Amino acid sequence: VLRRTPLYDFHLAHGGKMVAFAGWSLPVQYRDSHTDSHLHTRQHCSLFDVSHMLQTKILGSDRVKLMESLVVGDIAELRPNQGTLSLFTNEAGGILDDLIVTNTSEGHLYVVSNAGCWEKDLALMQDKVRELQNQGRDVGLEVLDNALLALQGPTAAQVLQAGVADDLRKLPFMTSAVMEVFGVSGCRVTRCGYTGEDGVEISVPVAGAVHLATAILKNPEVKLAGLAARDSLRLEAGLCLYGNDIDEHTTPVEGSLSWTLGKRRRAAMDFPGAKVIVPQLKGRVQRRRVGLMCEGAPMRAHSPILNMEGTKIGTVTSGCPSPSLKKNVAMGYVPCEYSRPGTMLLVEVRRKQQMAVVSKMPFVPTNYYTL
Amino acid sequence: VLRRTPLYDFHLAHGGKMVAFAGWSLPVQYRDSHTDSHLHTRQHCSLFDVSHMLQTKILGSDRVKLMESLVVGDIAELRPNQGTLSLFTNEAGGILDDLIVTNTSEGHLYVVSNAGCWEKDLALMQDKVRELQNQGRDVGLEVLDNALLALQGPTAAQVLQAGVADDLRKLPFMTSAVMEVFGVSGCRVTRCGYTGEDGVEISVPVAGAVHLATAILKNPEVKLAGLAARDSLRLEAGLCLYGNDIDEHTTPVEGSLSWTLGKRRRAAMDFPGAKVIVPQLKGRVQRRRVGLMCEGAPMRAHSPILNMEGTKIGTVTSGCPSPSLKKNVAMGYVPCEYSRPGTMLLVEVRRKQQMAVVSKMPFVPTNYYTL
Numbered sequence A, B: 001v002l003r004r005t006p007l008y009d010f011h012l013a014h015g016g017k018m019v020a021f022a023g024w025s026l027p028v029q030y031r032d033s034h035t036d037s038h039l040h041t042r043q044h045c046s047l048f049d050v051s052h053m054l055q056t057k058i059l060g061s062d063r064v065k066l067m068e069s070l071v072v073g074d075i076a077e078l079r080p081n082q083g084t085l086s087l088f089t090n091e092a093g094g095i096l097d098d099l100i101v102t103n104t105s106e107g108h109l110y111v112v113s114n115a116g117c118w119e120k121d122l123a124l125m126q127d128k129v130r131e132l133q134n135q136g137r138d139v140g141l142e143v144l145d146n147a148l149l150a151l152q153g154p155t156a157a158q159v160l161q162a163g164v165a166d167d168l169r170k171l172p173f174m175t176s177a178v179m180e181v182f183g184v185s186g187c188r189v190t191r192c193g194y195t196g197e198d199g200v201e202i203s204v205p206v207a208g209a210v211h212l213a214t215a216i217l218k219n220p221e222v223k224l225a226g227l228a229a230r231d232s233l234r235l236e237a238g239l240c241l242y243g244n245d246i247d248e249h250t251t252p253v254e255g256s257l258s259w260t261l262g263k264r265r266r267a268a269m270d271f272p273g274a275k276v277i278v279p280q281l282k283g284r285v286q287r288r289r290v291g292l293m294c295e296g297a298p299m300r301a302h303s304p305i306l307n308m309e310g311t312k313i314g315t316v317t318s319g320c321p322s323p324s325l326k327k328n329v330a331m332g333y334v335p336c337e338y339s340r341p342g343t344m345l346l347v348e349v350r351r352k353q354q355m356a357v358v359s360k361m362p363f364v365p366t367n368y369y370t371l
């Protein structure tokens, strides 16, 4: 029933406690508690198996045009092997999914989107490719079979450096390159992550997947990490979790992701939902995504947020205890008046009202490697 | 939100009455009644848009091995450019989806699956490719962007001959070829269908899709046909509608599809679900799919089937009036001792029993073009 990734056995052999996630079998954690796995990631580096995520290639001389007809970013402006976080929007301005798209030098776009949205996402693009060809233009879509690994943390680069002949110091955040990793040729190394720390993601061919993970794991700096730690790290980093912090009813502006909207796109008005989105850039927003902090009982998704008079003003979309801060962190939507960092709010926790404070994101300073 | 084929506007412009079908927006019928469209199809020919079905390619030298591990047919025995209907079965012998597999001379298997199952099937094959690649085998999957048109009827061949250089008399039932149809190159023409009549199916590159459709439609012999007509045409031909007549709870034996089991594989008991299927082939089976005919109001899906003793013995999976026979036809499951043609049964229709007779399928003799 549950789909397996090329590292299935690998997890079972390393104390991986499998669970159902987006129809896949993945380790929620391993031998060490997730809080320890978390802290370990922010001090050394951990290995994440994110092979369940959809990896696609947009081929054709008109690839950029196809992608920009679906996303909000300035894709054309992207330099070779340069990538960015972006969003798929609908005519209403909502978000269909968040993704990372890279303008590779192999004449193709390297797109990576959420595993829980692959059916939605693949149909969306497949349909656009057609619609585009129906208008006489060169474009193609192709799904990758490659496995996907994520090495994240301060010592992550050093570790991978041992198995690559390239100067990782020349691979800045959000750029990638095809290189042979630990013997496995044809790998895609992208300086990106979902942890807030420095790190990379290796798109490796299935045949070499286990070899790569084993090689990487041979280093004493590396420790495997499961879903649980993946989620607590990304929240501290203030990264969105599609389906929770954002969805088809939250616009890029309401979701505090305005920076993803390209400058030219803003001026062109050529992206789905632009009629709605652009006007909001002018403060015309009824709500906004913010970070919350509190003590004691942890704030959970779906919990109401009230002002200090106890009037409901919003809802929590994600929350869990922060290992790096020894407090509870969360994301939610509140009116603009209450989005200023330091704002005092109340959150219904475990049925009771709990005092919380709006925190600037990321809750923990990021360590992205930049030149 | 419904997905649209490359022929969406073409349908609207020709009077298509759009409806929701398997998540797509397709015409249920056009200007002419589904009844007249039906008959027109059996006397001349009709054009159907089936671009919503999943068209995939299995690449690699291990394609036959990958496929055989997923389907029941003898794939290795297929001569070049020869195709066959086949089934996807789980270890329990359940049918996951039915499809048509062609062993093209271009080094790849050409597969076509139901639109309503593209998520399931694609995942199924993708996962197998992954598993096989991790075993050093050379194999790959690829989804086609092509649209898919079906011209069915006694005059379809003639109508199409005017747009191709090749003698279609050389393209027997269940065989295909890559040829230039009405100016569009790269089209794969296949002598197959879902109507019981002679016919072809064209896999045409989207850019020429609308051109090919109008090109064909220009002939006075041709007339567009919608969903209702497609349903009544296949039912008369005794063909299964996955989801209705067969599903994951029906084996190829219970489904009266024993013939789809490859000749060699059947005798060797070497195919998915064999441990459940073989005993059934031998006789240890509880229910069989059959055809039923009656007068008055048409028998519909989910309607109870009973013997003359007021004992419920089965259910109707599909059903509708037959334009060609001016009677009501349907498919349903009944215990084996009640499956002999000529057997009288009672079927609940509009909250009232009606006398019905078990009929051998197809209800209307087919006219495939074979040598």
Ligand SMILES: CN1c2c(O)nc(N)nc2NC[C@@H]1CNc1ccc(C(=O)N[C@@H](CCC(=O)O)C(=O)O)cc1
Binding pocket: A053, A083, A084, A085, A098, A099, A100, A112, A113, A114, A174, A192, A193, A194, A201, A239, A240, A366
């Ligand atoms: C989870 N996720 C994800 C992931 O982890 N990795 C890849 N390669 N692709 C994807 N694709 C889909 C999805 C989108 N998730 C993400 C992924 C990355 C970020 C992120 O690093 N954002 C940065 C901005 C980076 C930038 O400048 O583009 C930030 O600190 O705000 C924010 C959200």
Ligand SMILES: CN1c2c(O)nc(N)nc2NC[C@@H]1CNc1ccc(C(=O)N[C@@H](CCC(=O)O)C(=O)O)cc1
Binding pocket: B053, B083, B084, B085, B098, B099, B100, B112, B113, B114, B174, B192, B193, B194, B195, B201, B238, B239, B240, B366
């Ligand atoms: C609906 N459907 C379909 C379709 O119409 N066309 C294609 N190309 N591919 C597919 N793939 C999935 C699905 C399966 N539907 C079908 C399609 C065709 C048949 C059919 O003509 N069967 C013949 C046997 C043909 C054979 O010998 O292989 C018969 O008379 O029973 C029976 C069922």
